[PDB]
């Protein structure tokens, strides 16, 4: 009655029985290494740049030992919870002959964090000159106080590439944009082996490694507030968002899933209102629809009319494309910062076509509406003519968001008292000299064909992965990535335990926008994030 | 000069000496054949029902290795810092013979946390049928990266029993459901050894497992907002409290200790002034008294008069048929959301008997009080008529929470805007798909002979233990406690690193309250807290 | 068909199996060379000072055999019903070399109780000088009429150290006193064995030793009459209390449980009546509420007015200089000996805010109350102005003891004629030459910013344990607890079968209160409870 995992009554394959002569035939037909071909060669892992800007003692690379240093181990790591052993490395520089400089590789032991000083070269290190063609090979040993590791462990032996002598080029003393791509390739050491099969589907108690929060291409980057594509970055002393922002505990202080979909509600008004209060039909928090905008109007306003724009204290309408070359707008509209949403006003006996929506969160005192810094089921304002008479009308609406009304304003997310929360707004300032960032994209206005900027605290892929998956990161640390544009400009972003992405520079500048991202590793939040801009 | 721990000249007994005939006689009288008997038998651990309603891939049993499995090791563990080795976990099942259905066993390694899914069976598993006669043992090996375990350690090898094939009765209809319960027992195992005997009176430098947070019986459960006994659980999307709510870091965003005792203050009303500001006399935070209640008033109002309520149309209520017969209450009373607080009210020269008080955090402008939910040295309001006439008095006063004047309002702790904090309000939402819970008490009302509900973030025993004892729990896990009522309907509560409690179902319903609570283990927060409601 | 307690088919771990290389590795990492380490070393028990002031025939050390000597046996003893065998009690002394003085050791048999007298040396005794270098062991043999001992057993072989020759310093003058302290350690002994492992959740049918009656620290001491913390002891020739005073038979001549919580009652005053009789709502004895205070008024009087006191000559007191400056007080107040009791005071139609109460056991004749110290269903007095007009009201009321209006009176519990009973007042006098003691609290007063002393027969932890747990103690013995203050001045309290406490000296004096209490053992009541006051 008891059966073991390798136990049963063997009947065979009725028509035939497995032949060894055919399995030996297939080995010679294909060649053969011993059951793991990936243990026999070096595989491309990453490449890093080294310009003339990087002075002596700077660190271009730090990645800790682990199975993420080789793609074939990152694949088979998914079938296990523990590992142990060394990784072999081969690195080279695609330099020129006219280039000098020299570069060093330092396997620092566990525990230590390095410092950008030439004192780290008072320790065994592999010199590599830019003029050197043949690559160089060396091992990264597993020096561990334990007997095995876990996939989340990042206190392992680590490698750093450090500038030993500055790179030189007598030519470009005007552009200073020289090259020397520095590739790193990896092979498993013979002492490498995985331990402890995990059951499939089972989660890891100590979590996984945050190596998939940002995609590897900017074509996939979209905002957590508006669905458009990211176009550039913004650095500010404070960065805050609640709606689709998720921390590493799968917790959001907002009210919406990491999706963009229509918003279904149910208005109910009478006597001629045009300014009703909806109620949720699809939600995660009771009262607020899933996907309701996280921004409030500037002031108290009584929506009754139509658009109205004018320039610097001039009473001159921007009827034409002379909108540009104005630099200040009054925006005299009675609807002055709402969100435009196409509606399907379904009702019994309306017998008239639907109308646009002009939604926001606010307190309905009367026909007017007051800015509500906080959201609630008693704050969900909608300004559209549902064609109401004296008797009640309980239409179904099913909005979808298209644009914005606040012409001539700052980017959505600059002002804080207009940005919506439930109770507590997440917020982060500078954390060890590193500055937080927004992700900037655009949203269409309602009157002028131009668009307005929008600030985002995350990329939606970063929110979807933090809503679903379980990662490890200590609070005093980042999950650091490296952004590289089509040119040789790069900078490291750092995503904290709260979900906010930081940057070490004060200004990124413009960048050729087909970008890529690679996971470097876990860093402390104190040490400034590397850059070359 | 030097003497070892076993060294000294023996003289013995002076009138007699120890005998072996008498020690042998005690082994005759007893059945003493070997010491450490718990190593020689299996001891009860628990028992699970396996019904036909339970589809495949469901987990029935799940325990991690450790000395909390067997009670005889849980006892000796108090003397040692460390342990190591394997436990043997016997399983017994008594099927009907005509039944069918196989049941799997998986010893998942350390570092994982199982899930209810057949993917767990894509892994080595032993099976045993309902027609299994003899018990099966399933030694759990100690797989460890360290050389010994501590007692605070919980990432250990675990064993799960889960339904491989559904249980089958050929006679039973599709409607009626049957079952066979599976019993679980444990024994220390041969390689099990404790390590590093500790001296008594020794702080253990990491604590122990969170096994003593919820008492094992409901008679000992009282809230952290009001002192009365719990009566039911309340699931809400957001849960929040500051005063007596403590986390695993022994730190609090509140102002009071986990104990209910009177509130001594002093108040120095000057002129004819039935209200004034009181100053702390006993405190852990400067300015705020210890035991001061964490709820404000709804509105700005002047306490001057008597009680008043109406049945939605001005019909005043003066009888139980009106109060219970009402659907809602207006409560036009002028001292609405406060606490009665008997108030001894001593002073020098105040020969008049004392008068009850009404307290909240609120500002004061010369007659009134406004709702201010940020407590300070100046947000300590009192209204008790300390017989003042045109002269500073400086009375001393001691106050004991009795009731709550806010008739008709919702349950206390249901509105953050009215709940009091210093700077930061601890608050949670649904971690995983597990909903938070308040613990429900009731508190007395003013002149009505009914009561009003009261919500609580913790049980006071949970707060008390987290103020004194040090525990490890990462911010991704829960300390799980299986609740079992009198009928056998059960569910698992999971306590947070933040101190809040959770439950893995949208509604618990009603249930017998002479109920219990047993620590099952540490559990990751994503995984839905198990339950069986009926 | 049948399966023994160690029987079942083993399959083991399915992914791995137990290893010995890893269990060996934990013994390498640790110092594990043998299990049950407490059998291999001597553990600290206590230490005594031997000074030159101490004449011959004085007893310094006295312990009976048992597992409460060593803490590692006191722990395992919780798993077993019985024990047997000998303990080894090491002694260490470090004299100056120039000292002289011999010290005796006597293992007195079971059935006796020693005395401080040289007649004890007319018996086999071993001696050891101040110049003793190495420790001495002195195994205590288990002489027993039974075949095994239980844990409740205390008539066991004992060992006493006593001064055979006074300690001598040739340099020290007759005035100055020196000393050498003797340290005592214990080890389980070779023939020691526990017996009859008990299943958990098992009542032990005789209990255990009275080792947990007084807590080990003074921060946890509160009286059985008022909830406040103790501050000093009070020796009186007679001691008496009924309400929360419990004996070792789990029986009481009182009416309340050992816990302080509010007092819910109902009162049905008819006409304009500021006083009436309340009826129990929560009770263990029919008629009397649980928590009702056990003290009467001094005199017949009508509660109608305000407070009033005078300084022996009509000079009213309205300031601290007058109260403290006074020698005695008249207290012409009309509501003298009662308790303030905040009184929520709800009812249907009583919109007026509540008013404090004044309670005692007393009769009532239409305006007044007379002191009746026999509590009944009709001796439940209240004076709180429940806004009654010419109509029965039947208010519900909850009351919480705050203070005591009897300004100027002596300490509460000092007059039997005022202390309340049902039928029988428990009472003791001087057993042996050991004087009883009250435990002293203080209770708040009415409008004075001072307090008044309060006497207590027990600590509430002592009452609580004697209500729930079953203990053996004959009516001739005491359960002894050695009190030690911060300076080292000590004395022994002995608790009675009746529940009362005693002390072996006429006056204790003043002493540091961060003090402790340790159980020394059972002691016959004739023998004077030892002490060392300084
Ligand atoms: K329509
Ligand atoms: K007074
Ligand atoms: K009342």
DSSP A307-354: -----TTS-----SGGGSS--------SS-SPEEEE---B-SS--S--
Residues of C in contact with A5 (CB under 8 A): 14
Helices within A343-492 (DSSP H only): 460-468
Strands of the sheet containing A193-197, edge to edge, are A149-150, A80-84, A193-197
Q: Are B245 and B375 contacting, i.e. CB atoms less than 8 angstroms apart? A: no
Tokens 């001597």: give the residue: C42
* Buried b or exposed e, range C212-228, using 16+ CB within 10 angstroms: ebbbeebeebbbbbbbb
The enclosing H or E element of B496 equals none
Pull the structure tokens for residue B331.
Answer: 């409560």
- Main-chain dihedrals φ then ψ at residue A198, nearest 5 degrees: -100, 145
Measure C462 CA to ligand 1 centroid, in angstroms.
79
Residues of B in contact with C6 (CB under 8 A): 40-42, 187
Asked if A196 and B133 come within 8 Å (Cβ–Cβ), the reply is no
Flag whether residue A4 sits within 8 Å of chain C, measured between CB atoms: yes
Residues of A in contact with C15 (CB under 8 A): 197
Cα–Cα distance for residue pair B95/B426, rounded to 1 Å: 50
Cα–Cα distances in angstroms (integers) from residue C333 to residues A287, C305, C309, in the given order: 62, 8, 7
Cα–Cα distance for residue pair B298/C53, rounded to 1 Å: 73
Cα–Cα distance for residue pair C530/C509, rounded to 1 Å: 15
* DSSP 8-state symbol, A363: E
Asked if B126 and A205 come within 8 Å (Cβ–Cβ), the reply is no
A 10 A CB-CB count for A348 gives 8
CA B424 to chain centre: 22
Tokens 């080894």: give the residue: C88
Cα–Cα distance for residue pair A520/A213, rounded to 1 Å: 12
Cα–Cα distance for residue pair B353/B355, rounded to 1 Å: 7
Q: Which of B81, B92, B111 is nearest to B48 (CA)?
A: B92
Neighbours of ion ligand 2 (CB under 5 A): B 345, 350; C 447
- Number of B:C CB contacts under 8 A? 306
Tokens 């990211």: give the residue: A230
* DSSP 8-state symbol, B356: -
Q: Which of B74, B189, B61, B99 is nearest to B137 (CA)?
A: B189
Cα–Cα distance for residue pair C354/C398, rounded to 1 Å: 11
Tokens 């103690």: give the residue: C473
A 10 A CB-CB count for A313 gives 8
Q: Are A437 and A239 contacting, i.e. CB atoms less than 8 angstroms apart? A: yes
- Main-chain dihedrals φ then ψ at residue B359, nearest 5 degrees: -125, 145
Which sign, positive or negative, has the C-alpha torsion B469, B472, B477, B479?
negative
Measure B344 CA to ligand 2 centroid, in angstroms.
7
Pull the structure tokens for residue C100.
Answer: 């002289």
Flag whether residue B394 sits within 8 Å of chain C, measured between CB atoms: no
Flag whether residue C137 sits within 8 Å of chain B, measured between CB atoms: yes
Cα–Cα distance for residue pair A329/A323, rounded to 1 Å: 9
End-to-end CA distance of chain A: 70
- Main-chain dihedrals φ then ψ at residue C323, nearest 5 degrees: -65, -55
- Main-chain dihedrals φ then ψ at residue C75, nearest 5 degrees: -85, -50
C-alpha angle A315-A320-A326 in degrees, rounded to nearest 5: 55
Give the ligand at the shortest distance from the Cα of B445.
3
Surface-to-core class of residue A239, CB atoms within 10 Å of its CB (0-12 exposed, 13-18 middle, 19+ buried): buried
CA C445 to chain centre: 27
Pull the structure tokens for residue C47.
Answer: 């230490």
End-to-end CA distance of chain B: 73
Flag whether residue A199 sits within 8 Å of chain B, measured between CB atoms: yes
Q: Are A433 and A504 contacting, i.e. CB atoms less than 8 angstroms apart? A: yes
The domain locations on chain C are 1-201, 202-534
Q: Are B331 and B309 contacting, i.e. CB atoms less than 8 angstroms apart? A: yes
Asked if B196 and C30 come within 8 Å (Cβ–Cβ), the reply is yes
C-alpha angle B495-B496-B500 in degrees, rounded to nearest 5: 75
Q: Are B97 and B131 contacting, i.e. CB atoms less than 8 angstroms apart? A: yes
C-alpha angle B305-B310-B314 in degrees, rounded to nearest 5: 105
Cα–Cα distance for residue pair C291/C283, rounded to 1 Å: 9
- Number of A:B CB contacts under 8 A? 108
A 10 A CB-CB count for C206 gives 13
Cα–Cα distances in angstroms (integers) from residue C343 to residues B96, B444, C340, in the given order: 64, 12, 9
Cα–Cα distance for residue pair B282/B264, rounded to 1 Å: 7
Bridge pairing between strands B102-108 and B477-484: unpaired
Nearby residues of A125 by Cβ (< 8 Å), 6 or more positions away: A104, A105, A106, A162, A164
Nearby residues of B9 by Cβ (< 8 Å), 6 or more positions away: C134, C135, C136, C137
Q: Are C163 and C104 contacting, i.e. CB atoms less than 8 angstroms apart? A: yes
Strands of the sheet containing C149-150, edge to edge, are C149-150, C80-84, C193-197
Cα–Cα distances in angstroms (integers) from residue B228 to residues B440, B443, B451, B460, C283, in the given order: 9, 8, 12, 10, 18
Q: Which of A246, A238, A247, A210 is nearest to A431 (CA)?
A: A238
Cα–Cα distances in angstroms (integers) from residue C321 to residues C150, C312, C405, C447, C450, in the given order: 62, 15, 20, 15, 12
Pull the structure tokens for residue C515.
Answer: 């003090």
* DSSP 8-state symbol, B209: -
Q: Which of B471, B473, B470, B490 is nearest to B482 (CA)?
A: B490
Tokens 């609406």: give the residue: A397
Q: Are A88 and A139 contacting, i.e. CB atoms less than 8 angstroms apart? A: yes
Cα–Cα distance for residue pair A174/A183, rounded to 1 Å: 27
Helices within C40-176 (DSSP H only): 71-76
C-alpha angle C60-C63-C64 in degrees, rounded to nearest 5: 150
Q: Are B182 and B103 contacting, i.e. CB atoms less than 8 angstroms apart? A: yes
Flag whether residue C35 sits within 8 Å of chain B, measured between CB atoms: yes
Cα–Cα distance for residue pair B278/C180, rounded to 1 Å: 57
Cα–Cα distance for residue pair C493/C215, rounded to 1 Å: 13
Asked if B113 and A201 come within 8 Å (Cβ–Cβ), the reply is no
* Buried b or exposed e, range A268-283, using 16+ CB within 10 angstroms: ebeeebbbbbbebeeb
Residues in chain B: 534
Cα–Cα distance for residue pair B185/B44, rounded to 1 Å: 4
Q: Classify domain A1-201 by CATH number.
A: 2.60.120.20
Q: Partners of B443 in the beta sheet?
A: B452
Cα-trace Rg, chain C:
30
Nearby residues of B335 by Cβ (< 8 Å), 6 or more positions away: B301, B303, B305, B358, B383, B405
SS3 content of chain C, % helix, strand, coil (to 5): 10, 30, 60
Phi-psi region of A504 (alpha: psi -120 to 50; beta: other; left: phi over 0): alpha
Pull the structure tokens for residue B1.
Answer: 């000069």
Asked if B195 and C6 come within 8 Å (Cβ–Cβ), the reply is no
Cα–Cα distance for residue pair A54/A532, rounded to 1 Å: 8
Nearby residues of B27 by Cβ (< 8 Å), 6 or more positions away: B33, C193
Nearby residues of B11 by Cβ (< 8 Å), 6 or more positions away: C126, C136, C137, C138
Phi-psi region of C67 (alpha: psi -120 to 50; beta: other; left: phi over 0): alpha
End-to-end CA distance of chain C: 73
Nearby residues of A227 by Cβ (< 8 Å), 6 or more positions away: A260, A460
């Amino acid at each position: 009655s008891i059966t073991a995992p390798e136990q049963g009554t063997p009947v065979g394959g009725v028509i035939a029985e497995p032949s060894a002569q055919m399995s030996a035939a297939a080995d010679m037909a294909t060649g053969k290494s011993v059951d793991s071909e990936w243990e026999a060669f070096f595989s491309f892992h990453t490449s890093v740049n080294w310009s003339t800007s990087e002075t002596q003692g700077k660190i271009l690379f730090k990645q800790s030992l682990g199975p993420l240093l080789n793609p074939y181990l990152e694949h088979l790591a998914k079938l296990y919870v523990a590992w142990s052993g060394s990784i072999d490395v081969r690195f080279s520089i695609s330099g020129s002959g006219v280039f000098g400089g020299k570069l060093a590789a330092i396997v620092v032991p566990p525990g230590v964090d390095p410092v950008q000083s030439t004192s780290m070269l008072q320790y065994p290190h592999v010199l590599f000159d830019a003029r050197q063609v043949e690559p160089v090979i060396f091992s990264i040993p597993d020096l561990r106080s334990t007997l095995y590791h876990l996939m989340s462990d990042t206190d392992t032996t680590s490698l750093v590439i450090m500038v030993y002598n500055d790179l030189i080029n007598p030519y470009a003393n005007d552009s200073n944009s020289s090259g020397c791509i520095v590739t790193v390739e990896t092979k498993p050491g013979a002492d490498f082996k995985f331990h402890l099969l995990k059951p499939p589907g089972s989660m890891l108690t100590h979590g996984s490694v945050p190596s998939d929060l940002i995609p590897k291409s900017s074509s996939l980057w979209i905002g957590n507030r508006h669905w458009t594509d990211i176009t550039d970055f913004v650095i500010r002393p404070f960065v805050f968002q609640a709606n689709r922002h998720f921390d590493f505990n799968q917790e959001t202080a907002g009210w919406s899933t990491p999706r963009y979909r229509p918003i279904t509600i149910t208005i109910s008004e009478k006597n001629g209102a045009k300014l009703g209060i909806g109620v949720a039909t699809d939600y995660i928090v009771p009262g607020i629809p899933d996907g309701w905008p996280d921004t409030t109007i500037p002031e108290k306003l009584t929506p009754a009319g139509d658009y109205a724009i004018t320039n610097k204290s001039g009473n001159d309408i921007t009827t034409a494309a002379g909108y540009d070359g104005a630099d200040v707008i009054v925006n005299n509209t009675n609807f002055k910062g709402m969100y435009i949403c196409g509606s399907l006003q379904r009702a019994w006996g309306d017998k008239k076509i639907s109308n646009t929506a002009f939604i926001t969160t606010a307190t309905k005192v009367d026909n007017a509406i007051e800015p509500s810094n906080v959201i609630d089921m008693t704050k969900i304002a909608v300004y559209q003519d549902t064609h109401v008479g004296k008797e009640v009308q309980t239409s179904d609406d099913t909005l979808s968001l298209l644009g914005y009304t606040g012409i001539g304003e700052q980017a959505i997310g600059s002002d804080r008292d207009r940005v919506v929360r439930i109770s507590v707004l997440p917020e982060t300032g500078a954390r060890g000299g590193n500055h937080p960032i927004f992700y900037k994209n655009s949203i269409k206005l309602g009157y002028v064909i131009r668009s307005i900027d929008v600030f985002n605290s995350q990329i939606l892929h970063t929110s979807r992965q933090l809503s679903l998956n379980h990662y490890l990161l200590p609070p005093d640390s980042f999950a650091v990535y490296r952004i590289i544009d089509s040119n040789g400009s790069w900078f490291d972003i750092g995503i904290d335990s709260d979900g906010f992405s930081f940057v070490g520079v004060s200004s990124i500048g413009k960048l050729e926008f087909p970008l890529t991202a690679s996971y470097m590793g876990i860093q402390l939040a104190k040490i400034r994030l590397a850059s070359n801009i």
